[PDB]
């Protein structure tokens, strides 16, 4: 064995994994068929993802990891082009053959700003963290085979001698070569069936300039300074600026549009589909009158997958290699950072005890598979809620209340870790949560609300129920559970901009 761990993929997941393991005394080799710099989506940070980066940073004493959670710290240390800003998620609803209303908006603001991650710069910086801590990296390589033996792993490489390790982590995405060879991936049982078209653009107009100013919308935050979701019956489109930070230099804006394949299947080239969308929804088109595409569109016809298992004696698939649902709500980054946080202490224990058995990693699998399942219910039910603004308004409080509870839970874990310095206590506290992979992590009342609300939405889809009935059923569920949630007034449906505290 020339290494302790081989990591496939040098993106943020592989890089952070490599950094924390190398920091902790393991000899790590990161392999990637691609090379930096390169484009990637997965751009909208969340409260959870920020807390998870800070937890990773504190758990392994790597300060630079925490920089990646704060836009001001990204600008200062990674570079001024490396992010935009977000003060929350905003949602504007539209329908075909009718004018769009600036009152069909919800936007619950954050207290602390978060980042729109320009992944080419963020990921390259992350790899630099790993390299500076002693992880080895080989870019632009070709893996010829991966052998999983009872005494380790052996990876054959084109035009080089094979490399050996005790353990292999797949930190790649849809191209997970372990996933392909292990036969663990499937689309069976997934409620979400969606496609995605995405690119980066110049000269994308702000929501306030294109559609309605703050004096009209009454939003507490500029939608320009938010992850903006334009939602409609068959899909949604994101507007994620990198050019909205007063000290930023990036000129681009990320644009992605997604369809529920059960309701609309695209047939034509990405630019033609984009123009058809804008004709259908002229309000959305107001962003793009002077816009130009700065890259080729990428089209993915089906973005959803899960896995039946993701750990063995000698391997672990990180979340992107295991399952993905949708960009909606940006749950992928969350699941990724939490999975690293759960896995890394176990890999260290394994390497120190020289014991490599599947059962040691079972809670990593339990978290990841539960997270993908929860993500599938969240997103599938959301796409059904896209049918009507009032329904969306009621529905978004189910997501928000859960996310707020999970964020608060992670914030508390971080506080305890910062002051106690007690890594083992933290690891055990995260593992002891009652609902790993669920939005609240540990609230039986919230998970009751989530389960029952998803049942309402699936039944509404299945039986084509009237949207007013569904919205009301959700509202009554929120009222029933509200006493056991954060005291934000989630049942006050007329307040479309739910504030913290
Ligand atoms: Ca070693
Ligand atoms: Ca994503």
Residue numbers in the entry: 2 to 502
What does the paper say about this structure?
A bacterial halogenase PltM was originally identified as one of three putative halogenases encoded in the biosynthetic gene cluster of pyoluteorin, an antifungal compound containing a dichloropyrrole moiety. Recently, PltM was elegantly demonstrated to catalyze mono- and dichlorination of phloroglucinol, yielding, instead of a biosynthetic intermediate, a compound that serves as a potent transcriptional regulator of the pyolyteorin biosynthesis, whereas another halogenase, PltA, which acted on a peptidyl carrier protein loaded pyrrole, was shown to generate dichloropyrrole. Herein, we report the wide substrate profile and the unusually large halide versatility of PltM and its crystal structures that reveal a unique recycling mechanism of FAD. In addition to its remarkable halide versatility and a very broad substrate profile for a phenolic halogenase, PltM is at most ~15% identical in sequence to other structurally characterized FAD-dependent halogenases, and it contains a unique C-terminal region (residues 390–502).
PltM is a monomer in solution; the crystals of PltM contain four nearly structurally identical monomers per asymmetric unit. A monomer of PltM consists of a large FAD binding fold that is conserved in FAD-dependent halogenases (residues 1–389). FAD and halide were not found in the FAD binding site, consistent with the lack of color of the protein and its crystals. The C-terminal quarter of the protein is a unique helical region not found in other halogenases. The putative substrate binding cleft located in the interface of the FAD binding fold and the C-terminal region leads to a conserved catalytic lysine residue (Lys87), based on structural superimposition of PltM with structures of Trp halogenases bound to l-Trp. Indeed, mutating Lys87 to an alanine yielded a catalytically inactive protein. The C-terminal region then likely helps define the substrate specificity.
